[PDB]
Amino acid sequence: LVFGGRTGNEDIISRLQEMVADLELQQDSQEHFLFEIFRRRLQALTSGWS
Amino acid sequence: TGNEDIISRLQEMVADLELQQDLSQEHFLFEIFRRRLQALTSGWSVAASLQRQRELLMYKRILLRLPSSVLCGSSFQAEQPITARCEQFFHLVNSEMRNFCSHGGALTQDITAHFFRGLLNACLRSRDPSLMVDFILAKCQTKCPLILTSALVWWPSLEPVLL
Amino acid sequence: HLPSADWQRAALSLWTHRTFREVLKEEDVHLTYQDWLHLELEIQPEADAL
Amino acid sequence: HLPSADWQRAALSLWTHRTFREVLKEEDVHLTYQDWLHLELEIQPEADAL
């Protein structure tokens, strides 16, 4: 029985939030890598209705 | 353990006030740090010493979580309005963090990198970046030489990041 | 949604009841922002209820 | 060495051991950044040594 779902790490999303603010101020026209990654994961999924 | 959401709320308000300032002035954080160090016992007893050590390591933690922009500000306008908040920071490094948040006559990898990242950020955002970098790192020989002495030990770390 | 409807109902009946509202005005009791922060920090990211 | 002594001492004696160091140099073993994350994501804040 899988009985819901566990979390693991709200820390690591904070460790991301940092690097995000950093690169962002370093830039400040060009486009972000996040939306690229999102497209890659949506593409690597199955295209079915199941 | 209780708080990682509230620290995110802090990050939110920090970035807000960062952009409000980008719209020279010195940050209220360093004032709060000075007030708590002052309101500690100036007595040299191990109780007070350890309490001060705890308080500084927590200060170091809060600044490593928050952006490297609160250290150096952002977008140094001209050479006349220069070294604002960095003297605020240097006073803290000389008075306090050199006592507790050090090792081997030098600083911490974490805060060294946090500072240098903030430095290159604001400098490269500003014009004459090499010249203004050289200016502030010449000031550091007089105001807070720990940074340079730290950056000699933590160079194999930073050089890739900075390059 | 959450545990027993009677505990829930009890809380709401108390909350709506007038003399609670008339007491909440003159107040040391009115939950200062700092007191709020002390309780919100007391709780964990472990057993949330939210 | 197979001491049935304390675990802390055991771990550190194994670290110090040269042959373990010689093994880490052949890099199917060196714990990538990604493998690092895949473990650190396993663990919970709930129960934690640190």
Add this chain to the structure above:
Amino acid sequence: EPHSQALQDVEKAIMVFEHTGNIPVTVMEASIFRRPYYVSHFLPALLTPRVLPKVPDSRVAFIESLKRADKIPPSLYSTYCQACSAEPL
């Protein structure tokens, strides 16, 4: 085979419910218009003929939300609850 696939499907449905509330809607579509696979899936949704702990939790709340949706004909719920109650050497 549709039993194991159905358990993977109900796992996903429940952890979407968690990240949300209010019933993942893929499943509510599959309910009215895939009744065969709805019952091949809804057997795994009631595969907790098992210790139901004192506090409500994921599975508990998931199935409560479904029976509030007026799905689960009370036959299978009654079944669920009943099964739940449980020299040479």
